[PDB]
Scaffold this active site. Sequence first.
Site, PDB file in Angstrom:
ATOM      1  N   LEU A 280       0.823  -1.203   0.000  1.00  9.61           N
ATOM      2  CA  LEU A 280       0.000   0.000   0.000  1.00  9.61           C
ATOM      3  C   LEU A 280       0.858   1.254   0.000  1.00  9.61           C
ATOM      4  O   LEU A 280       0.554   2.213  -0.707  1.00  9.61           O
ATOM      5  CB  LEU A 280      -0.922  -0.009   1.204  1.00  9.61           C
ATOM      6  CG  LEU A 280      -2.306  -0.577   0.956  1.00  9.61           C
ATOM      7  CD1 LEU A 280      -2.356  -1.403  -0.324  1.00  9.61           C
ATOM      8  CD2 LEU A 280      -2.715  -1.404   2.151  1.00  9.61           C
TER       9      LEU A 280
ATOM     10  N   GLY B 208       8.251   3.485   2.607  1.00 13.46           N
ATOM     11  CA  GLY B 208       8.929   4.481   3.404  1.00 13.46           C
ATOM     12  C   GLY B 208      10.427   4.322   3.275  1.00 13.46           C
ATOM     13  O   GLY B 208      10.921   3.314   2.765  1.00 13.46           O
TER      14      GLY B 208
ATOM     15  N   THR C  28       7.842  -0.523   5.136  1.00 17.21           N
ATOM     16  CA  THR C  28       6.836  -0.519   4.083  1.00 17.21           C
ATOM     17  C   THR C  28       5.574  -1.181   4.618  1.00 17.21           C
ATOM     18  O   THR C  28       5.634  -2.004   5.536  1.00 17.21           O
ATOM     19  CB  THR C  28       7.321  -1.277   2.849  1.00 17.21           C
ATOM     20  OG1 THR C  28       6.348  -2.272   2.497  1.00 17.21           O
ATOM     21  CG2 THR C  28       8.656  -1.970   3.147  1.00 17.21           C
TER      22      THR C  28
ATOM     23  N   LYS D 191       2.684  -3.678   8.766  1.00 22.25           N
ATOM     24  CA  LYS D 191       3.856  -2.799   8.692  1.00 22.25           C
ATOM     25  C   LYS D 191       5.141  -3.580   8.946  1.00 22.25           C
ATOM     26  O   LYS D 191       5.308  -4.110  10.049  1.00 22.25           O
ATOM     27  CB  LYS D 191       3.735  -1.677   9.717  1.00 22.25           C
ATOM     28  CG  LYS D 191       4.906  -0.693   9.768  1.00 22.25           C
ATOM     29  CD  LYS D 191       4.548   0.525  10.653  1.00 22.25           C
ATOM     30  CE  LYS D 191       4.895   1.834   9.980  1.00 22.25           C
ATOM     31  NZ  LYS D 191       5.437   2.805  10.965  1.00 22.25           N
TER      32      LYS D 191
ATOM     33  N   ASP E  32      -1.637  11.412   9.134  1.00 24.50           N
ATOM     34  CA  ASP E  32      -2.191  11.100   7.816  1.00 24.50           C
ATOM     35  C   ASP E  32      -3.692  10.808   7.927  1.00 24.50           C
ATOM     36  O   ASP E  32      -4.124   9.651   7.891  1.00 24.50           O
ATOM     37  CB  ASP E  32      -1.430   9.917   7.203  1.00 24.50           C
ATOM     38  CG  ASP E  32      -1.849   9.598   5.760  1.00 24.50           C
ATOM     39  OD1 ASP E  32      -2.954   9.976   5.311  1.00 24.50           O
ATOM     40  OD2 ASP E  32      -1.059   8.935   5.059  1.00 24.50           O
TER      41      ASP E  32
ATOM     42  N   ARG F  19      -9.274   7.513   2.499  1.00 28.56           N
ATOM     43  CA  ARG F  19      -8.691   6.190   2.273  1.00 28.56           C
ATOM     44  C   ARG F  19      -8.290   5.543   3.594  1.00 28.56           C
ATOM     45  O   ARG F  19      -8.340   4.317   3.730  1.00 28.56           O
ATOM     46  CB  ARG F  19      -7.489   6.277   1.328  1.00 28.56           C
ATOM     47  CG  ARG F  19      -6.601   7.477   1.601  1.00 28.56           C
ATOM     48  CD  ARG F  19      -5.236   7.456   0.883  1.00 28.56           C
ATOM     49  NE  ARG F  19      -4.273   8.267   1.633  1.00 28.56           N
ATOM     50  CZ  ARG F  19      -4.068   9.582   1.491  1.00 28.56           C
ATOM     51  NH1 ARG F  19      -4.736  10.300   0.592  1.00 28.56           N
ATOM     52  NH2 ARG F  19      -3.171  10.189   2.264  1.00 28.56           N
ATOM     53  N   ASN F  20      -7.916   6.352   4.583  1.00 32.93           N
ATOM     54  CA  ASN F  20      -7.524   5.855   5.896  1.00 32.93           C
ATOM     55  C   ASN F  20      -8.681   5.773   6.890  1.00 32.93           C
ATOM     56  O   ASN F  20      -8.438   5.580   8.088  1.00 32.93           O
ATOM     57  CB  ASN F  20      -6.424   6.731   6.504  1.00 32.93           C
ATOM     58  CG  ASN F  20      -5.171   6.728   5.682  1.00 32.93           C
ATOM     59  OD1 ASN F  20      -4.979   5.860   4.832  1.00 32.93           O
ATOM     60  ND2 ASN F  20      -4.299   7.701   5.932  1.00 32.93           N
TER      61      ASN F  20
ATOM     62  N   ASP G  99      -4.532   3.538  12.641  1.00 30.93           N
ATOM     63  CA  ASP G  99      -3.568   4.181  13.519  1.00 30.93           C
ATOM     64  C   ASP G  99      -2.153   3.817  13.167  1.00 30.93           C
ATOM     65  O   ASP G  99      -1.320   3.739  14.068  1.00 30.93           O
ATOM     66  CB  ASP G  99      -3.804   3.828  14.989  1.00 30.93           C
ATOM     67  CG  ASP G  99      -4.038   2.373  15.214  1.00 30.93           C
ATOM     68  OD1 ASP G  99      -4.167   1.991  16.395  1.00 30.93           O
ATOM     69  OD2 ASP G  99      -4.136   1.627  14.236  1.00 30.93           O
TER      70      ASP G  99
HETATM   71 CL   LIG Z   1      -1.985   4.737   2.612  1.00 25.98          CL
END
Ligand SMILES: [Cl-]
Lengths: 308, 302
Positions: free
Chosen positions: A22, A25, A29, A48, A140, A144-145, A158
């Site tokens: 998705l 970083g 990721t 994550k 963020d 979408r979140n 979160d």
């Molecule tokens: Cl995202």
Amino acid sequence: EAPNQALLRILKETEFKKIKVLGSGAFGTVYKGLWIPGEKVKIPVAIKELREATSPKANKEILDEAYVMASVDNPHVCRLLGICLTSTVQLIMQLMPFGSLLDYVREHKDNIGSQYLLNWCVQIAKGMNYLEDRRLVHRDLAARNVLVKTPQHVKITDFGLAKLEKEYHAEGGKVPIKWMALESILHRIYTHQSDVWSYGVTVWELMTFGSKPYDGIPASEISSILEKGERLPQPPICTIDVYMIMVKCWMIDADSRPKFRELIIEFSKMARDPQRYLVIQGDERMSPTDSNFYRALMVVDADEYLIP
Amino acid sequence: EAPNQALLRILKETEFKKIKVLGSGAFGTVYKGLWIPEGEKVKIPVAIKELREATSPKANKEILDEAYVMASVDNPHVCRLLGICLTSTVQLIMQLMPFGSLLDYVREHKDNIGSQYLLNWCVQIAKGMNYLEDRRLVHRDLAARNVLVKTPQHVKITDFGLAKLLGAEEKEYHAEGGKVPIKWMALESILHRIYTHQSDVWSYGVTVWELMTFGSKPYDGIPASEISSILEKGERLPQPPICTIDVYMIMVKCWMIDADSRPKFRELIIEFSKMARDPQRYLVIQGDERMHVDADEYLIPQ
Ligand SMILES: [Cl-]
Ligand SMILES: Cn1c2ccccc2c2c3c(c4c5ccccc5n(CCC#N)c4c21)CNC3=O
Ligand SMILES: [Cl-]
């Protein structure tokens, strides 16, 4: 204080499979994921994973993150399903089978109901004020979140939370120019009032039924247009009173922007008389259903399993 | 009640340039400006108000509140804002009355003002006011300086910076201190910082005075601090020589101590409108018989 009896669950890498990436970083990721488990049910999840197996400081952070998320418990903030201690640590965060709100709203815009729209704003404001009661910055917020447990119930991811003193800086790569407060854009710093700015934007996406903010505009231009005092246009559905609430979130000054407890009160007050504050054609008659994102998995919500 | 679909439009400051300064205030400044809408190919004359600083949330909150009212009211004699500018210091963009304040207008043209216009203006002011009574909003700073002349035929109300909106629960609004000039305010507002539509009427009565005398200062000799005493003493503004007893009487009622005794705006429109049918009778002015690339507010509406 009181004991934090938060359960932490350790899942084997075999137990969960990662469909797709998705976000990415500099460190770590985030993958769309499926969790199975010896049970028939499959659960959608967000995982994550640390990019690097051997960094003491990175490992310290990722464990604190897992500490806060597991410590978090609110009806509208995603629960942390567990973590898995590979060399590269992964964290599993629950995802809802129906999907995210943004997609859901676009799929169902014709049948969308005004009461539901006001109701989601009260819910998101609840998760955020929960988060903000602990000194925690979402960094963020977006549609979408925000995840749809049910059309009546939504939850916000979160992932990547930052905990405070006044301000925290954050560098990851792949940054969301459109949703961020101008202060965040110029200096890469995030406060609760910066999160409110993202909240304002989120409500916009909901109100327009998922139009893209500042569509077709380069990210470099955006910082300038905010300085010139351009902002997002009035949602046709929106009353002036509701729009004003969005406008206050987009005020350049941080403190001028509304605090979250305010936003909860206001939207619940407007939620008592939704039809006066939001006007949708054929508003009175409109139904709960499965979603396109949910179609692809074809799933079980995590919350129901865990209850026993 | 009904949904408010009044719409507020956001405009980037690159859309409008300011040719000249109309007036100065400590809060901030008003500019004469040409506004070009993006995409659209018309030039709209406009007035832009700009605050001195964006420093204070209270300053920020009041402007946002002011902008909310000026967009939500729609009346032919209430000046409306076209849009807002979210710049650090917020900018207010409003229809432009080119002529300027009525008070300014009366002094320059005193030689040419016919009796009908003075009556016709009085009617128009009340009509806008009466709308604000309907909207539950108290203007809180009425004066001939806050009455602008889009045209001599047409006049609109202005400067809602002080205006506050009454709660349904509460009949009257009280605010600490007084920003506004003393002479216009009703005695209850000076003594108790109390404001009501009836208190607005009092200021209305002072606005008519200003028109009938051609803009002379109220209580011109007196310092503001004394004013509260003299009202209690019972002095008041004197008969405008042009004015008959029928017209002046009306100004007396407005400056009555008891707020409930003074006339309501609804009444004031009918009373001044009836005078407007036969103006010569109710106003005596020498030479009275002798006396009589494009954008607009009209353009925006279908
Ligand atoms: Cl995202
Ligand atoms: C002082 N002034 C003028 C002087 C000469 C010609 C016009 C104006 C004017 C106008 C407005 C305003 C206006 C609108 C909102 C608030 C204040 C306004 N002023 C002056 C009041 C101050 N400061 C205005 C004003 C709004 N449209 C105007 O023309
Ligand atoms: Cl973006």
